[PDB]
Symmetry: D2
Subunit: 387 residues, 4 copies
């Protein structure tokens, strides 16, 4: 079969005015041929565009590319990953519905789930999804959705997607997986039984750290139509320029991910053997609890992972004396990022959830870029071996 590198470099669809690169449709509205042709496009009949919020050609191009790696019925682009998460949950969940979600999630996902959803009459439970039995125990007659991050931000906690999918399929609950950390190159949730696969495009998919974006993919046509229906009213849209950049960045995704995976594994192997390091939470290491599920359900690993220092001051010493790694939040960028979860990405997370995640000031999160691995390792080495 045709390789994914070829698939991404050759998206389906006609060229516009014979242009090799797909044009940036920096426009708000579209022109109608006639009143009937305009009336029909609102009804759903005929091919063409109306208004960029409903559909934009360069945006739709990016959606097609994502839809093609995911193996979905359709994809929806968003202004942010949080736009994707809101439109993948609130498009389906309503007053009286129950949501089971992982206890270890991205900071703002926790914020959306614990603060905003309960205000909308939606029952939410944060559950350890590494254990399928805990997921079964939390299940209720009104359970409509299970939301998973695996490997989780930032602890790399592994969940049994395949096993949970079964329970979701038997009981009529929609399974949504956030696969941001791994990318659609190595994790394809819809193959594992999930109903909706989503990403923060801001991270690996774009990879260049210059755009905030989100994407959501559905196994079903009805489900993607509902997501786009919600997006129409909620209004989280990917800009034409941002879509152009994301598609462009995605052109090199497979090879970037290959280097990410290998760099990340080598950095983690180096850290785990280092005197100053207590523990390394990389899902590709044999020492890691959820390794056997991760290697079975994914075809590779992302390069973002967590590790434990002997103290906060030691962690502070490492982070502030690096010359290649740059101290900043976010991840999945071409260059290596480094961050302190306890006081940055997960400072807003309540300590009730903080303890069980479980994030301590000794922890450092690293997102290994595509720089020569030896340069990255040497940079960490000299910082770890300071006076």
């Amino acid at each position: 079969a045709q390789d994914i590198t070829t698939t991404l470099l050759h998206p389906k669809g006609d060229h516009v005015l014979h242009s090799h690169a797909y044009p940036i449709f920096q426009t708000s509205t579209f022109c109608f041929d006639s009143t009937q042709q305009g009336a029909d496009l609102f009804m759903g009949k005929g091919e063409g565009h109306i208004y960029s919020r409903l559909g934009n050609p360069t945006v739709e191009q990016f959606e097609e590319m994502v839809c093609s790696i995911e193996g979905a019925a359709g994809s929806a682009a968003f202004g942010s990953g949080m736009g994707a998460i809101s439109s993948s949950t609130l498009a389906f969940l309503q007053k009286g519905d129950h949501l089971i979600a992982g206890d270890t999630l991205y900071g703002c996902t926790v914020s959306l789930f614990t603060h905003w959803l309960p205000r909308f009459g939606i029952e939410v439970d944060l559950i350890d999804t590494s254990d399928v039995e805990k997921v079964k125990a939390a299940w209720k007659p009104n359970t409509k959705m299970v939301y998973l991050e695996s490997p989780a931000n930032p602890t790399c906690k592994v969940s049994d997607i395949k096993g949970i999918a079964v329970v979701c399929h038997e009981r009529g609950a929609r399974l949504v997986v956030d696969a941001t950390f791994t990318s659609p190159c190595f994790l394809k949730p819809l193959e594992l039984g999930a109903d909706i696969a989503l990403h923060s495009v801001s991270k690996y998919i774009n990879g260049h750290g210059d755009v905030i974006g989100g994407v959501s993919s559905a196994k079903t046509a009805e489900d993607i139509a509902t997501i786009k229906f919600y997006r129409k009213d909620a209004g989280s849209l990917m800009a034409p320029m941002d879509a152009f950049l994301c598609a462009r960045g995605m052109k090199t995704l497979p090879i970037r991910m290959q280097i990410h995976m290998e760099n990340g594994l080598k950095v983690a192997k180096f850290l785990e053997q280092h005197e100053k390091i207590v523990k390394v939470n990389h899902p590709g290491l044999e020492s890691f609890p959820g390794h056997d599920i991760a290697k079975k359900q994914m075809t590779g690993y992302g390069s973002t992972f967590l590790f434990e220092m002997k103290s906060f001051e030691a962690a502070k010493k490492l982070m502030e004396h690096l010359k290649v790694c740059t101290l900043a939040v976010s991840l999945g960028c071409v260059d290596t990022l480094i961050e302190h979860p306890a006081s940055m990405t997960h400072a807003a997370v309540p300590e009730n959830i903080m303890r069980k995640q479980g994030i301590t000031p000794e922890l450092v999160r690293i997102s290994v870029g595509i720089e020569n691995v030896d340069d990255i390792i040497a940079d960490l080495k000299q910082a770890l071996e300071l006076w």
Copy 2:
């Protein structure tokens, strides 16, 4: 004090590397000097940036421009006017609360209020808000908000914002006003007593028809923080490039609006005197019901208005034989747009609500651009006399 033209041309803020034009900050994340400096910003102390979703310098520049015209404590930019509307309502409204909204609104605003809000346990009533005592009768103990469009899409129906604001202040409810149609140049809702003033930037504020965006401005610092706290999780953001283009477009807004207003008035008066036109729904016309309310509360008028034809076939012939006007949805663009509400912008609106709005197959909506008035009038004259 500076004039509106000068204020928008010289926005408050520092120059970046002595750059005359403000740089497009096409970035996702930002760097930290130290752990403490990064940890501080998340709290947040005191000056600096973290991540574009939380704050982007180019986006913030546009936000401050809108804040200066509205007379607000702060403004938040969005990826769409719908992003602004959702964030201006769902940030405050929760399960068990009650919203009163105008019966005539933009199509997707009707879609948002009728479909999605009741799913979140929010009570919504669509009420004729041109009558103030009708809002008082629709009131409940759990009423937390009133939402208004004045002039409303597409009928140009006018609401007494100042009068409704008094009711909202006395009874503990917020007043949110969609001022897309008139722009902040002519309509400043926060001066009329409203709590939140929002726009579809995609329309007049940008004015060049090349970007989708929204903005919301709050009277109090607490409300705008809550709005931005919602945007943080909801995720409707304005792209750095779009922020650059919106700010750029807003540079000529005052002079564009002045021409929009004058053009829209002459075109409406031309249509009113024409024998093939039943009625023209322009808020600046003496004949229009609620003209006096619009005259006192607004300093000018938008260029988007509705009018009635003899039949559907007559409307069809007009829209399909224009050479200058472009048949397309949207409004507030530099060139002239024309649209059919019944089967386009307000086609997804439930036929129950479409009846109360007064939207018929004979009605045509025009958005008069900044072309020469005589070119637009002549284009209409040619199409009408076939």
Copy 3:
């Protein structure tokens, strides 16, 4: 209005898009070998490569082509890209060029340093006197280059008068109309052969893109220009072309307020005690007013004025709250500059005096702010 023409340009919509798409592409696809071969030979419609032609860029070119009344227009990466392409495409070894003594700094740099390196004889003379153009004439004179009103002194030249001399003696007339814009100055309708602009200024008007455009009277001349651009390589970027076309949408409207603002400012400065001389082509005091009044349908907002001393000029320029100390002109906001030590600092010491540039001269570019706000900003700086 010209506005209607600019808002509704010639051409077909792309996938029904209201705004013309940004063709951020390098190359284009072919249906077959024959179709691709044909386009390289000029047969059929379509595109090959962005340097040869870009749809977004061509859309801007056609907007300029309409207002200028040209056979064709070519966009460039800079005004200097337009200037050098409008001269070095025609001038060759052994040719002679007569150019105005007062030109933009880098246009002087081009003509004085680079042009004579290519075997092109260049003389800079006073083109405000038409009889002086006749005296500078040589048997090998192939081109006259003009700039009216000139940067920065606003020195007006009789374009139609010089055009007659050029036509009779077989020479091209190139006019830099940056200072006035195609709204008010249309050189091709005064008998000029080539009309060019620094789009960076009024045409774009938003001070966020560098670009140039050149419009030719004949189809052969623009083909020569585009043939030169193909090899020289000064191209307008697709994004920049998008921004320039977008900026052009408000051009006539911006120029109306530019003209009126610049006039009221100059009239204020002329009656002010601290100002010796004001060089605005719209003022009746200005020497070349009669020529400018008849040849142009309006005036730009960039002009020059004389202070008592350099210290007084420094005091004025460094205390403005609204106006900005910056080079460039034709922006929506008001810019201020000092020619002797900035724009015309590189201009040779002998051409410096022929132009009449002194350390006392201050150049202002009046934007589209409220007239009273800019006048008040100048008023407080000239007194406090």
Copy 4:
């Protein structure tokens, strides 16, 4: 020694408002603090900006990146490769000066050298530069410059850059090398004795087929100042937006070139063993004349090469029946391009020069992208094996 992947991902210079990605300075002019501060910057004193034509921060960031791989004193970015070629030649050559240039050059370079330079009183001779003795024989007392393309567009003809450099150094002539076909990753002319190394950034460096651009680098500070002095007058500038994209595209240059090189070699080796193909002109093959010079003087190979079919109609049949490869001009793009030199890129070159270059209607130029090589080979295979 720090690897080039790391170098390109971590360019020197300060971050702007703590922004991770370098901002797009979409501006015309810059503000001054005082009259003297503005006067000094024109005089050359102080830091740093005045007007985008003289210097744009975004553009200078890209120039910095190119300067870093090249090992130059400075770099200048342009609106096109032809902008770079003109400014590297016409910035130094005046009437009475003599230029020696390769006989096999890019189409428009031939146009510039044949049509425009002679009009400026500059003597030009197109010479076979694969033979050092022919370069020596063509030499004159007024010879000021030698311009080389190696491997040449499109025949891939190899020139002895090192050997020609010596002659240039001994006789006081600048050596200028166009290294577009190979990229700075594999060919660094300044290490070989060239004075100026230039690229069409439109090709490999940007790599994404969305930007037209050029860059020129000099060994000497005076020379790059002269090039920039010409640029401000001639007017070929890189747009801030284009600069942003080129820097972005350059982030992944080393890894893209790794795949280009290996893909290109595998495609060439497949074509050479195929019965329909008469000859393959890839500089990395042992059969190719000048392979020994190429493998010594370069660190790798580009993926653009030319091959001979049995007929024009056979060439037509191949080019017009590909499903992955796209029929278009240009090269060095992320996806595979294909064109016909005799009727396309080199249809404008005079017949006396085209016969000298060896371009016949049987020839096909392929620019191998970063698609899975087996997919590329399979696409060519089915097109070659048609009924």
